[PDB]
Structure formats: structure tokens, C-alpha cells
Amino acid sequence: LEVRDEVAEKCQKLFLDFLEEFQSSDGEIKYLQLAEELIRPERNTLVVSFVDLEQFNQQLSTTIQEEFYRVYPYLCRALKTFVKDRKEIPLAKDFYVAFQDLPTRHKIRELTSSRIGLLTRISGQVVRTHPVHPELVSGTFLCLDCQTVIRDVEQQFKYTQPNICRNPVCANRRRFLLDTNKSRFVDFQKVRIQETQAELPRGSIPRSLEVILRAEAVESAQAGDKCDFTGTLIVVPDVSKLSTPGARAETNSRVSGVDGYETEGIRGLRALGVRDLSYRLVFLACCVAPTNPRFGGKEEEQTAESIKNQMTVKEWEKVFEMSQDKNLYHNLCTSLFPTIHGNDEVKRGVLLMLFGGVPKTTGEGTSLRGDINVCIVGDPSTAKSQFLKHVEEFSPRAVYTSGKASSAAGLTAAVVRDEESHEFVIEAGALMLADNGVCCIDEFDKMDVRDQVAIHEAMEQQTISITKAGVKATLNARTSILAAANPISGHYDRSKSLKQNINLSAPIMSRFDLFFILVDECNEVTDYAIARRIVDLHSRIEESIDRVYSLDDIRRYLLFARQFKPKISKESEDFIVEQYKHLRQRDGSGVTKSSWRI
Amino acid sequence: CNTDQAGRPKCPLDPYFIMPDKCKCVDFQTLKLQELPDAVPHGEMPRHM
Amino acid sequence: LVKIPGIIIAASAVRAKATRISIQCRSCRNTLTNIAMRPGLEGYALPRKCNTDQAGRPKCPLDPYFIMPDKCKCVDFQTLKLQELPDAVPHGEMPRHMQLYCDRYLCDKVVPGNRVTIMGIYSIKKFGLTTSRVGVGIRSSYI
Amino acid sequence: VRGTPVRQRPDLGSAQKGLQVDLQSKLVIWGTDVNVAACKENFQRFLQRFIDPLAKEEENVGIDITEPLYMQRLGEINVIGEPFLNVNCEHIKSFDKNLYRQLISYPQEVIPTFDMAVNEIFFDRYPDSILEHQIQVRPFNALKTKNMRNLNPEDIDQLITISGMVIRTSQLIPEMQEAFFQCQVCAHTTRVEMDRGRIAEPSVCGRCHTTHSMALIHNRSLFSDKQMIKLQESPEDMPAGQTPHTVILFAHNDLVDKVQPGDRVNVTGIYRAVPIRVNPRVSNVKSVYKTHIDVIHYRKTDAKRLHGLDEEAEQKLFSEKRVELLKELSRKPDIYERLASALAPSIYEHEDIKKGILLQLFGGTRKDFSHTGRGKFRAEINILLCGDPGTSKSQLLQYVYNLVPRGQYTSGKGSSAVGLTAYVMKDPETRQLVLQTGALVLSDNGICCIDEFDKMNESTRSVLHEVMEQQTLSIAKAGIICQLNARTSVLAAANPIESQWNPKKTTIENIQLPHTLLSRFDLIFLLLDPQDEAYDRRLAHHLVALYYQLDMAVLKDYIAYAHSTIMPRLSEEASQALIEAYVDMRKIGSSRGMVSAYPRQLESLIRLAEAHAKVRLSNKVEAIDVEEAKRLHREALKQSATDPRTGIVDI
Amino acid sequence: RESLVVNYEDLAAREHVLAYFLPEAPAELLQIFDEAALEVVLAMYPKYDRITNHIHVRISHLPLVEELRSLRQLHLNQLIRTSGVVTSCTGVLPQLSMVKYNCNKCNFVLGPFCQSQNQEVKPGSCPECQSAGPFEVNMEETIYQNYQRIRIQESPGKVAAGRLPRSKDAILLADLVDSCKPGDEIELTGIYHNNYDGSLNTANGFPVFATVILANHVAKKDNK
Numbered sequence A: 001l002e003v004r005d006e007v008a009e010k011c012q013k014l015f016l017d018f019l020e021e022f023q024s025s026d027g028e029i030k031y032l033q034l035a036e037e038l039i040r041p042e043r044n045t046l047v048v049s050f051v052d053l054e055q056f057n058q059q060l061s062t063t064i065q066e067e068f069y070r071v072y073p074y075l076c077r078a079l080k081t082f083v084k085d086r087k088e089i090p091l092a093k094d095f096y097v098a099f100q101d102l103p104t105r106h107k108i109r110e111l112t113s114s115r116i117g118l119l120t121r122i123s124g125q126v127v128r129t130h131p132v133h134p135e136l137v138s139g140t141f142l143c144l145d146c147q148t149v150i151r152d153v154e155q156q157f158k159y160t161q162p163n164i165c166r167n168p169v170c171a172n173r174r175r176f177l178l179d180t181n182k183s184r185f186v187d188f189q190k191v192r193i194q195e196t197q198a199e200l201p202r203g204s205i206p207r208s209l210e211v212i213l214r215a216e217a218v219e220s221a222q223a224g225d226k227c228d229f230t231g232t233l234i235v236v237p238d239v240s241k242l243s244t245p246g247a248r249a250e251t252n253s254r255v256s257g258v259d260g261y262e263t264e265g266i267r268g269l270r271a272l273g274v275r276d277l278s279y280r281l282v283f284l285a286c287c288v289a290p291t292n293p294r295f296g297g298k299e300e301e302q303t304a305e306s307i308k309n310q311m312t313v314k315e316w317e318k319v320f321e322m323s324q325d326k327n328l329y330h331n332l333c334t335s336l337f338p339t340i341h342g343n344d345e346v347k348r349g350v351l352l353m354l355f356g357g358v359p360k361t362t363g364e365g366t367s368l369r370g371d372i373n374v375c376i377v378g379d380p381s382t383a384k385s386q387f388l389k390h391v392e393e394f395s396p397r398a399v400y401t402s403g404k405a406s407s408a409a410g411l412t413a414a415v416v417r418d419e420e421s422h423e424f425v426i427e428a429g430a431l432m433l434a435d436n437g438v439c440c441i442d443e444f445d446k447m448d449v450r451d452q453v454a455i456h457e458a459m460e461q462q463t464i465s466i467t468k469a470g471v472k473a474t475l476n477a478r479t480s481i482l483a484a485a486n487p488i489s490g491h492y493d494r495s496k497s498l499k500q501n502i503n504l505s506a507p508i509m510s511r512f513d514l515f516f517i518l519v520d521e522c523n524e525v526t527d528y529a530i531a532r533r534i535v536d537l538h539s540r541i542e543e544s545i546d547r548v549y550s551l552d553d554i555r556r557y558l559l560f561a562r563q564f565k566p567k568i569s570k571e572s573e574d575f576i577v578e579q580y581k582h583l584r585q586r587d588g589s590g591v592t593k594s595s596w597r598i
Numbered sequence B: 001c002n003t004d005q006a007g008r009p010k011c012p013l014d015p016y017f018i019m020p021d022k023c024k025c026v027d028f029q030t031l032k033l034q035e036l037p038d039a040v041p042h043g044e045m046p047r048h049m
Numbered sequence C: 001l002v003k004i005p006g007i008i009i010a011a012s013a014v015r016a017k018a019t020r021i022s023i024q025c026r027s028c029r030n031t032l033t034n035i036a037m038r039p040g041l042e043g044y045a046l047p048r049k050c051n052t053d054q055a056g057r058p059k060c061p062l063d064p065y066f067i068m069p070d071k072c073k074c075v076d077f078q079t080l081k082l083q084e085l086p087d088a089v090p091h092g093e094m095p096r097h098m099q100l101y102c103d104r105y106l107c108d109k110v111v112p113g114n115r116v117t118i119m120g121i122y123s124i125k126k127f128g129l130t131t132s133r134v135g136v137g138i139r140s141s142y143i
Numbered sequence D: 001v002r003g004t005p006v007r008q009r010p011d012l013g014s015a016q017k018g019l020q021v022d023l024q025s026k027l028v029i030w031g032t033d034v035n036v037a038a039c040k041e042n043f044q045r046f047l048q049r050f051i052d053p054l055a056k057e058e059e060n061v062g063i064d065i066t067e068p069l070y071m072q073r074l075g076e077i078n079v080i081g082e083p084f085l086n087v088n089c090e091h092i093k094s095f096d097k098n099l100y101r102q103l104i105s106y107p108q109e110v111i112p113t114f115d116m117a118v119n120e121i122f123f124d125r126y127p128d129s130i131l132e133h134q135i136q137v138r139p140f141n142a143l144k145t146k147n148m149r150n151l152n153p154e155d156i157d158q159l160i161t162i163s164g165m166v167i168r169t170s171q172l173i174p175e176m177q178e179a180f181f182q183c184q185v186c187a188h189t190t191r192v193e194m195d196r197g198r199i200a201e202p203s204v205c206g207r208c209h210t211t212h213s214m215a216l217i218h219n220r221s222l223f224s225d226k227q228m229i230k231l232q233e234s235p236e237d238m239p240a241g242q243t244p245h246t247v248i249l250f251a252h253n254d255l256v257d258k259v260q261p262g263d264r265v266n267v268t269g270i271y272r273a274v275p276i277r278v279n280p281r282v283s284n285v286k287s288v289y290k291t292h293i294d295v296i297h298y299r300k301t302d303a304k305r306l307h308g309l310d311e312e313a314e315q316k317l318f319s320e321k322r323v324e325l326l327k328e329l330s331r332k333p334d335i336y337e338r339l340a341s342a343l344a345p346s347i348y349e350h351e352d353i354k355k356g357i358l359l360q361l362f363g364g365t366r367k368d369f370s371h372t373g374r375g376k377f378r379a380e381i382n383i384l385l386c387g388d389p390g391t392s393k394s395q396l397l398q399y400v401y402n403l404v405p406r407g408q409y410t411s412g413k414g415s416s417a418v419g420l421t422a423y424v425m426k427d428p429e430t431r432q433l434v435l436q437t438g439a440l441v442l443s444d445n446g447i448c449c450i451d452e453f454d455k456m457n458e459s460t461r462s463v464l465h466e467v468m469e470q471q472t473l474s475i476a477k478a479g480i481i482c483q484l485n486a487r488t489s490v491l492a493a494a495n496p497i498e499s500q501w502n503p504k505k506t507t508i509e510n511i512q513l514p515h516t517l518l519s520r521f522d523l524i525f526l527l528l529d530p531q532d533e534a535y536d537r538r539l540a541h542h543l544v545a546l547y548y549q550l551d552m553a554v555l556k557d558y559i560a561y562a563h564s565t566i567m568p569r570l571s572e573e574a575s576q577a578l579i580e581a582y583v584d585m586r587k588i589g590s591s592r593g594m595v596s597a598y599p600r601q602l603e604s605l606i607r608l609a610e611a612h613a614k615v616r617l618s619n620k621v622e623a624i625d626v627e628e629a630k631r632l633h634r635e636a637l638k639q640s641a642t643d644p645r646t647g648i649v650d651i
Numbered sequence E: 001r002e003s004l005v006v007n008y009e010d011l012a013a014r015e016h017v018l019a020y021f022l023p024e025a026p027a028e029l030l031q032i033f034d035e036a037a038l039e040v041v042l043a044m045y046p047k048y049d050r051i052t053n054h055i056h057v058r059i060s061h062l063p064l065v066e067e068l069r070s071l072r073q074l075h076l077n078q079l080i081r082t083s084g085v086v087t088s089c090t091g092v093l094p095q096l097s098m099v100k101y102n103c104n105k106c107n108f109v110l111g112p113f114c115q116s117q118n119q120e121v122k123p124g125s126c127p128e129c130q131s132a133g134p135f136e137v138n139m140e141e142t143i144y145q146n147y148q149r150i151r152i153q154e155s156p157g158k159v160a161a162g163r164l165p166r167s168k169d170a171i172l173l174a175d176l177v178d179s180c181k182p183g184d185e186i187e188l189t190g191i192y193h194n195n196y197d198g199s200l201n202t203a204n205g206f207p208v209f210a211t212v213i214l215a216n217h218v219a220k221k222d223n224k
């Protein structure tokens, strides 16, 4: 009458038991309260911690982990019955289970055909995300030959028509009409990720795979994020041929065509129903989370209070106690460039650029920039590249790039066609992954003029406009630029102005708030101090780094402080005009010429 | 026409005509069999085959 | 009948479009001459059945007709690309374009770069209600 | 057999008919001269009693008198879990020459027989051992095909060994092995294995008898791994006018991801010929077939190279006798000089260049500066050879190129910037655009030899800045954004401006390289010609003697041991010596037209000292190491012959 | 003007059941509203039937303001209100509205068929000669309607965290055409639409659906 998946049915009942019996330290059934939130519209996924599942039933966790693909529909059925009786839900609202906190993590290179269909957690860097589309999960069809209605045929990550019409004296296998208003859909997103740079073997390009997000996980991973996907590796039928033929599938019915209808050629292949078996690996992610989270409390808009609630009480007491910390300016400078000796001005400037100013829009419409751009110009081996590396490793949303290694489409934005629909997907470049972050351009003077134009456009108007491949799209580039540039001749001639020493275009130089000249003085005492710092770092690697604040602490603190929008007091206004008058006065006749004019 | 490879332009629907002189024919007779008169039940029409 | 101005930005090579065609049946060789073709970007579907009958003789095939190319009255045929006059485009606005179909003595009356006024029939392409995405019921326009 | 699963072998292809034919009107396979019984018994005779009577080294288990060499290997397969036996085909050739001839000629019929024989022997003993599948034999070291262009259609489906460099490896492709079906009506399930490369769909369920209701369920099916590898062949026979050759390899299930681009490998596999479709969407195939290798075995060892990273990381690479011999060598007072002199033995008295190259082969101490915010520190040593022509720079670069694994050779204008970093091509086997690495990534853990460094435009020489400073290659191209690893050592050779050193110009005026780029090299050897008649005579004798008439294996193993185990750390008195050395060298190099010293030359000294301590197998950097770093740094650049005002003269 | 703007606040305040039914099944509700508006206008103006013969009702001030990044399969077939920036805009195209066909086998003109936004109307037989054979649009007896596709993306100010703006296609019909312009910032009310001819059945990938917004009301955000 009907075969029953014994392991899947058993797993379903055990999972409902876990849902309605597992209780947390408060002694209350936690997933009942969690699924109370699930009566909402736009709310269809319960997130179940795998450590809880392990504590409650080791065998159930093992079965779920090993046979995840086959038992997942039954876990979803268990969630539906759990939320059904307890509440008043739309009858045809599907619910999904999103496991989280898997202990073990796998490499993207370890996603072999052994892991297919079973639960895994991988981490990658999101390369691009595609639009959310409605996906057909199970369609109802109409036979065009006998008008019978075939209901609920499962789509296997491919548009599948019914194998055969339900009417037995109608053996239709070709002509079906999808009754789209009776079919059910899910929210689908495809994102491309690639393996992280700490995972690459030697001589290898990073592997990319496309992961599939569904109903409520759908919009979680954005480009540039180092995210941590848990789900199942799956095969998806593919279109890849002209290779040698291989791995066919034909009917096992022993059938031979008659004279004039011989089972040969195109007709014979159609009649035997032969089709190539070509697959590619795709990740079906049920949950997404950052690999290195900023807070332990939560993860739509951002206000200081929202950030403060998003963090634990310990984290915010730390944030507060450094906010009340006198000498926090020097403390952050030392804690954030621990290995760099000297260059205290450059440390202060880079820190301020990290915090940034207040962006404002005039009544007429012009935007007043609020992002500090900093350029570091200096002699060889003066730690310019080290400053850029420090910021790039510290700051989330920081991109590093060098002079000629980048194109213009790879620096700002590209457009590629969405293979799933008529939509168009934008490929983000360095200046967009660094949005509300820092773009560390290294070797800035050697960076092509045709690319200096793109940099200048994003620096001056904080936006990038695309008119290519069939779309116009204006994009936000609210990056702050941290650049390093060599002087002409490789050395800074103190007898010339800054303009005469670097070959940056004047518009670029004008879009820089601070210019830090790092001249190499041939000083023996500073030679000694630098030597001690370098040799000490190379002697005691982990030690010799005594930063007053954790680097995660700074990340949280900075993220919190970026929500503040300081005002300008009247006395601050008067002081500003007075200091500007002094600054202008330093640039008059008689006195020695300055490097650049105020 | 199954041989639509010896040229790209195609043959019609139903292109085939029997070749009468190339057919191997055999002899052919039809007989009418009636039930044996002794085997017909008493008041009963005979069966045929 | 519309009258629009514009500048011509492309002019195709003059080609041959039939005004009358003749078709011949593949089996009986009988012809179906002087079929009138619709003017403009409109096609023609051949008859799917031979007219001639001879009950004693067997019938012709299903689609027996073939264009006889030498028995065809062809005329000159050009397609133009009209852009909205640059002085007529609204300020922040992409120009509009229009496809034009010329015929027999309107061919080569203009070269790209000419400012022209056109009189013509605002028409759609009628090539058979086929060639199926997003826009439904949309058929390409031309003058 | 112990009930242990006998996994299918995709590397042997899809099974054949396997028809048995009797040659009397004994029971060979059709089209072959093998009968499975006698082949099986011959191989069992081979496994049980084969002893190499000439080989005694690098076994680390092999008693090499104990009657089986290979049943010792079976014992290992019992100790470890991996069910693979690597059989050297030369051993089979010694034992049974006819069995060898049969193996390379019908591998698809002989290798499965070898598998049955091995599993019978193994599970005779070890009858309680548990293996995730039965043992699969991997024959390697067949008679090397010197040029794969010499292979004929007579050779199709035979076992061959070739060598070359891995150029590209694909992503892992899932190959179906067993299909899973459910009825759309009754949910009855069935499974169908691949049979000769196709799956016969059930077409009627055996439960509810509905025609064509069983549906293939892809993600309940069983799959195997496959990987395409582009290998640039390295033929030993190079006939006139023949261009280099790229061969397609297909690895399966376990040899997948076993080689990385830039690896030099000996690959044993089956020479396959496959039909090409005329379009991807039709089934017509061309009359002219294309060829690939179905990889059976990867051999990474090469007698003339150094040990690769995969080998060095292997724990049992040295016997205790070998380790003791190496340590005894390290106690020699002049092990440094001996090892240096073992390099490029045919090159005459460039002792300092050879010491620098030895230090480059050893390299500095890999450090994890990750918790310091610093970034990544370059442990590699970059040497620049600047000198007037005819002084044997290209010979040294050629020697290092032909000695290291993972090396690349570049010369002059023949390379571009994207040809050194990376670029997109379209794989003409998948019709897909794939990313290909260039020379600087193919040597990611090796030495890139750049010859004619000076005759090479600044466009491509800017690419070297990030490679030499940060060991990474950030590419922001149209769609692809990433950071390729380029932890290369750079051995560069360049001529002076005017191609000949002229003594009227200072060192900086005469090298003529951007002064930021010179600081990236941690040794600049000035290969200058003294107009010296005695040296002329000695070199002339060396060169003429070259026209009529320390080991390598010990050097190879010494370097491998040092890379595996020695991680030199700076001692306090070494720290002080480095501080003083940097201050002094900075005073010295601040002169008129000398190559100046930057804080980067202190790290140059640190790297050289760590490498030198590693030559001693020291594990602790001491003042002697820093002293030799200073001396090498000064001898290169000829700073004793340099006055603080002008150029140099002669030694 | 052949179009009547109805404020949703006023409709809900007067009659809340129609207002509650309006965004759940707007295709049917807007059809009904159009018929009733035609009746009321023809009652008020008897001579207006020769002007337009169809009144469009545009719903204004809908409270269901969803940003483009938040439309889901939950919203399908529902009246939504969104805002964004017009990035592209086709020309006004003529779309078949009440299509007459020619039987090009006997030249009979096959009576007017309504052209839905969902599928091509394809006639069956010819009423006279009963041919299934080829037909053609009778372009002289057909009546057309104005058509225009616009692409609307989220205003760059709204997209904020560091993420990319999302865009949707919208279809403006017969009064709404040329009410936008590339660069305009608009408020779009329309039916989030799924079911016409875009479903990716070509195995070119996953069975995802292309969606469009049938614009019902467009309100620019600027001075005039």
C-alpha cells in the first residue's frame, strides 16, 4: 500500500520528543517558547542547537548527522506537528529546521562524495549573492493528453515533470502543464562562496562552490562576509558534455524497434530514454552564521542601543570601561599597532580614520563627506605596507589591494548575468566590499591612471555607477581609503613639496585628509630602537605583544562607537574657526615654505 | 523514411510504397469448418469455425 | 498613417523581398503561381496540401510545395534605424528609436545622418505569432 | 575475503564483457592471453616470496632479507587502515617477466586479479582485521615511456608511466556509482549499480507494478570522486622541433587532490582513448579519438630532486641509521662548506654564491605572527646574482631549477604580469572558463628562478614586489577576487647597466634596479670578473677538464631532515649580535653609492642566521650563525672592496 | 484621463472589508473596482463611453510598504507598496489588448480575445473553416494598449549595511507609461507577480521563478 522509511519515521518521532521535552537551565521547554515566535508570518524556521540534540539523545543526533538529507523532511514534519496543535497556524504553512552549533567543522576540500547527503558545517568567504527567487519545491501538473492532475511531484533541484501520467491507459511522459497556482514555493537564494585563504594548499586557486539558502536563511550571507554554513552537500544534475560520453541512464525494458523504426540514432536514444548522468556539487545550507562573530548576543538597522542589546553584559561592561578610560587614545594606538616602533602620528591618524566622522547632506542636496582618507608616503622599508596590513587584518570589512594587480571592474564593480532568471547580479569589487570599512590600497602611485579615475570617483562622491551588460545600477561606496605610496625616485626629497615628490593626480591628493610623510632619518638611536623591536618580536613571538585591549574588544568598541554622531557645540565652532585661522596663517610669506598649502 | 541521412533535405510523411515484385508471397486458403453432424446436440444449430 | 521626424543612424543593404511568389509541388510538379505577398515585415505560410486532384492517381505528400525562385517578383527592400531628433529629446532622457521599412523607390533615398520626416503606417511585425520571458503580447514595432 | 566490501575501481574503467575462451578445439580472457587462475597464483607466489637482493635503504620497515618485501607491506596495511598496496612493477619484472608483460598489456583484466590475490593472502592471516574496503593494488614504476608522443594506437588501454608537472587540478566531480529509486506511487525503493558505464532504470516497480513510476533520487545515490588534472609532460626524449605537451589525467576517489599545481610527479595509469562528440547536445562522435591517462598511482619521489613537502611531512622518511648518520654529519666542523660544495659541482669556485644558494634551499624559520597583528613574515631567502656576462649565473639558476621540486624558470621578456600571477582560460574539455595559475604561483613553496632580471619590463617586475614582501598575490580582476599564495624563494640573475660592469660607476649606478626592489633581496652577489690571470688559468683548466672526464642522497636527506625537525629560535646573545650587526651595517651602507640598508636588512640577517643554524641542525640560533650571516651579506656586494665614496676594484 | 485614484485610507475608513480583501486578491478586486468605476462614471457622464470604455482604479497610500529586499514568495499575488529608483525604462510599446486574428486559410477575422498579462492568447479553430492552422494578428481590427517595462532598484541611501541594492522589474500599462524616468525616485504599488512564462524549466538550473510587479499606482517623489 505504502512503504515507510523506518529510520526516518523513528527519527521524526524522536525529534518531536526532543522538541517537546528538552528543557534548558531554567527548566522550561525551550523549543516550545522558541516555536511560539514561529506563529508569525515571515517566520518559518526553528533554529535547533545541535549540542542540545546531542545531550538529549546521542543516537538521534548521530542518525540526523549521518542521514540528514533523507530524514530532513521528517524533521520538518515533526516541527509542523509541534507548532500545529499548540497554536493556530495557516494549514499550508511549511516550517523548516535549521541546525546550528555542529561541533566539527570540515574544509571545503573535504567536501567529497562521501559527505553527500549528510550534515556538515563548512566556512568560506561569500563571493557573491544572487537575488531571492521563489523556488518550486513540489509542483502539481496537468496531463495534456487525458487532463488528469498529478499532485505534489518533488522537484530535485531541477524542474522535474512527472515520470508518467497517473492514468495507466495514458502513458504520457512528455506533455504536462504546471498548475503554478496550486504548486508550493520556497524562498531561494544562491550564493557563491570560496575557500578561505588560510585553507589553501600550495600552488592552488581557491575552490568556489555555490551554496543554496532557503526560506528564512535566505538573505543572511552578504558579499565579503566570512560566513559559516551548516547544511548538506548535494548533487545537482548538470549540463556538461562534448567530453567523452559517460554514465548514461537508459530503461531496463528490453525493447527493439521494428523495420523503419529501428532503435538507432536520435530516435533510438529518445526511445530508450537515455540521458547523461552529470552532476555537480552544491551546498544546501540550512543555517548561516559568521565564522568569527563580533557579539555573543544577537545578529535590521543599527543604533547604539541596538548594538548594546546585541552584546552580552560582560562585553558591554568592557566597552563601557574603555569608553570611560582616560588615555584611551594612546591605549588604542598601542594596542592596535603593537609591533611598530615610532610613527605615533601615523598610528593616531589611522585610528581616527577607523572611527571616521559624521556624513551629512545639505538641504539643497550635496553630501558632506564624513570619511577620513589617509595617505602614507615614505622611504623604502618604513612599515607603510605594515600599517596597511595591520588595518586589513584588524578591521572587518577591510580590503587590501596593491598597485597594478587590480583592474577597474575588479576594483569597483562588474555585472554578470543571472543564470536562473532575467535578473542581473553585480560582482562587488574592492571598493564595495570595503563599504563602511577601509580599502587599503598599497603601492598607490603605481596604480593605473584608468584605475585612479575609479578610485577618485568613489573618493569624491562615495558612490559607484554601473552601466554595463544591460543594467544601470548605482552602488554605495562609503569606504575610507588608506593608501601607501612611494615617492618618485624611491626616496623623499625634503627640498621639494609633497606635490613634487609623488605622482598622484591633484584631484586624488585633494581627496586625502591626512598625508603622513615617513622619511627615513639615518639616526643611530632610532636604528637601535627599531632593531630592538624587530629582534624582540622575532625572539618572543606571542609574547612581546602586551596590548591593553583585546583586538576583539576594540572591534566591538569601534563598532559601538560608530553609531554615535557627535554634534558641534558653539564654543567648538568658535574654536574651530580660530584654529583654522592659525592653520592658514602658517602658510604666509617670510616663514619657511610648507610641504602643501592649507 | 528511415534513411534521411544520405541527404539533408527530407522525405515526406508516408513515403513508402509496397514493391510488389520484391515481395515473397506464399499460398493462402480459407476454409469454412462446420461442426460434425454427429456432434451437434439434438435441437441445436451447428457451430462453425 | 503617422508622420514623425528623426535622424537616420543606420541603413541596411538593399535586399530582395518577394511581392509575388510561385510554389511547385514536389510530386506532381504543378505550380501555384502569383501568390500575393503582404507588404512590410509580414511572412507567408505555404499551403500544406496540393490543389490538384486525380482520384485514380494517388495523392501528393503532406507539405509538397517549394518556392520556385526564378518565378518570383522581388522588390527592393531596406530597413532603417530612426533616432529621435537630438533637439526633440527631453533633457535627462535617453533618445527613442524607431525601425523603418522602405520599399522599391524609398530604398536609398536617405543615408545615415540625414534628418528626415517619415510618413508611414505604424505597424507590428507579423511573422507568425511565435518566438516566445517577461513581455507577453509584445510584438516589435516599425513604421 | 572477510565479508569486507570490495569497492569498485573507477581508475580501471567500466567493466568489460570478460568472455572466457578455450584455445583448444587454456581458458584465457577473450582477446588476451591471461587466465585469471594462473595470473592469480603467479601474483600470490610473487607476494609471498619476493626479496629485493639489491635494495637496502629508505624502507624504514623493510627487513629486506625477510622473505616477503610485500607481506611486510601487508602487515603495515594491517597496522594502518589504508587498503592500498603499491607494487613496484620492476619487482614483478624481476620475479615473473611474463606476468609483468601481461600486467602492462591488459591492466583492466590483470589488476583485479592482483586485487583478489592480495586480499586472499591478507585475510588468510589478519583474519580478524577490519578494513573499510578490501585491498586495492596500485602498480607503479612501469617501464617509463620517455615521450608520450611516441605512443601508438597499439598502446591504447595499456599501463604506462610518465612524468611531468601538474599545471591545473579541477574541482571534484561526483561520479555516480549506484542509483537510488523510489516509486512515486508506493514509495518502494531500489538500487542499481553502474554496469559498463550505464544505469538500467527499473521501469516497473516490483511492489505496485506501475510502469515507469520509479524516479531516480540523486542525493540518495552513491557517488565517487573524480578530478581532472592538466599535466605538462617532461619527456626524456625531445625530438627536434617538438613543442611541449599537456596530458589530461583523471584521478579517482583517493588520488583526488593528491597533487597540487606545480608538483612534479610520476604518474602510472592506463592510456585511454575516448570519443569526442561533435556537439555537446548530440551523440555523433568523431572518428579521431582523444586520449588521457586514468591515474593508477602518483609517485612523488625523484632521485635527482629534493624531497617534496608531502614527503618531508611524512613521519617515517628516515631510518634511525640515516638520522644518526645525518646528525653525525651535522657535528662535522665544515658541514656548511661540504654541503655548499656539493651544490652545482661542475661550477668552479663560486663558494659564496653556493653557500647562499644552500641557505636558500634550507630557508629561514617559519613563524606564526598571527596574534601580533603584524601579518605574514617571509621566511624565504631571495638571492640576486648581478654580474657581467659569462660568469655562470644562468648555470646556477639552471642547476637550482633542475634540483628543487616546485620550481619555475623565467627569462627576460618571455613572461608577463598576468602570466606570472594568474589568468582565465576556457578548459577545452568542459567548455568552461577556469582559472590558471602562472609561474609565481606554481612555485608557491619553491624557488622561482628569474633570469635576465634586468631585461624585463617594470610592468611585470612590479608583480614581484608583493610576492617578495608579503608572500601573497592579491588579484582584484573583473569577477574573481582572492589572495593567491606565492611563498616563493626568488633566485634572480641580472646584468649591470651596459651589460658589463664598468668600474667608473658606483654599485647603485651600475646595478640599476629600483632601490625599493633591491631591499627585497637578502643577498646581492656581485659576480664580477677580476682581470686576473691566475683565475683565468684555473677556470680554463676546470672548463677544459670538463671536456674529457658529497653524495646527493645524503644532501637530499639532510635538507629534508632539517626542514622536518629543525625550527631555529633566536638566543639572547644572538639577539644582541643582530642588533649590533644591523646598526653597523646601516652605518656602512649609508655611504655614497652603496646599496643602503633598511630595517628590512635586519630581517634579512635574521633569515640568513636562522637558515645557517638550520644547516647545523642547531634548533637554536647563536652568535656563529649571525656572524656567518654578516659575512655572507658583506662578501656579496663586495663591501670590503667598496670604498664609502666610489665603486670597487678587484680581489 | 481614464484612471481614478482611490485612497486606501479613505476606502478602509468607509468600508474596511473591501480594504482588507484588496491586498489579498488584488487582481479580482481591481477588476471589480474597474467595472464599478465605469458604471459610476457612465452614470455621471453618459457620453464618456466613447472616450475610454475602461476606467482604471489606482490605490493610493497603501500601508503595506515593503522594501525591495524583503519581497518573498509570501507576497506573491498580493498588492504591495515599494519605493526605489528607476534605473531603466523601455519605450512605450504597443501590446495586444483585444486581439482580432485572421484565419489565413479562409480570411475570417476571429473575434476579439482579451490579452491577459499571463500568457499568449492562441486561438483554437477558426469559427468558419474549422482550421487549427496558422493565424495572424489582424493589426487593423486589433486594439492595443500601452506597455512599458521599468527596472526599479532600492534607493542607495536605504541599502546601508554594506550589501548590494536589489532591483525588480515593473510593468506600467496604458496610463502609467511615461510616468517614470531613469533616475526618478518613486513609490510603486502593484501586484507581486509570479505566473506568466518565466519559471526556468530549461534545466538551466534550479526551478526558480522570475517575478514582476504589475504596477497599479506610481507616485513620484519630487516637485512638479
Ligand SMILES: Nc1ncnc2c1ncn2[C@@H]1O[C@H](COP(=O)(O)OP(=O)(O)OP(=O)(O)O)[C@@H](O)[C@H]1O
Residues within 6 Å of the ligand: D346, D347, D348, D349, D350, D387, D388, D389, D390, D391, D392, D393, D394, D395, D396, D494, D495, D539
Ligand atoms: N666559474 C665558472 N664555473 C663553471 N663554468 C663557468 C664559470 N664561468 C663561466 N662558465 C661557463 O661559461 C658559460 C657561461 O654562461 P652562463 O649562461 O652560465 O653565464 P651568465 O652569467 O648567465 O651570462 P649572461 O650574464 O650573459 O646571462 C657557461 O657555459 C659556464 O659553464
Ligand SMILES: Nc1ncnc2c1ncn2[C@@H]1O[C@H](COP(=O)(O)OP(=O)(O)O)[C@@H](O)[C@H]1O
Residues within 6 Å of the ligand: A339, A340, A341, A342, A343, A378, A379, A380, A381, A382, A383, A384, A385, A386, A387, A530, A533, A534, D469, D599, D600
Ligand atoms: N618603525 C618600525 N617599527 C617596526 N618595524 C619596522 C619599522 N620600520 C620598518 N619596519 C620593518 O620593516 C619591514 C618592511 O616594512 P614594509 O612594511 O615592507 O615597508 P614598506 O612597505 O613601507 O617599504 C617590516 O616588516 C617592518 O617590520
Ligand SMILES: [Mg+2]
Residues within 6 Å of the ligand: A384, A385, D469
Ligand atoms: Mg611597501
Ligand SMILES: [Mg+2]
Residues within 6 Å of the ligand: D393, D394, D395, D451, D452, D493
Ligand atoms: Mg645568463
Ligand SMILES: [Zn+2]
Residues within 6 Å of the ligand: A143, A144, A145, A146, A147, A148, A165, A166, A167, A170, A171, A172
Ligand atoms: Zn494522461
Ligand SMILES: [Zn+2]
Residues within 6 Å of the ligand: C025, C026, C027, C028, C029, C030, C050, C051, C052, C060, C064
Ligand atoms: Zn501535387
Ligand SMILES: [Zn+2]
Residues within 6 Å of the ligand: D183, D184, D185, D186, D187, D188, D205, D207, D208, D209, D210, D213
Ligand atoms: Zn510502486
Ligand SMILES: [Zn+2]
Residues within 6 Å of the ligand: E103, E104, E105, E106, E107, E108, E126, E127, E128, E129, E130, E131
Ligand atoms: Zn478559417
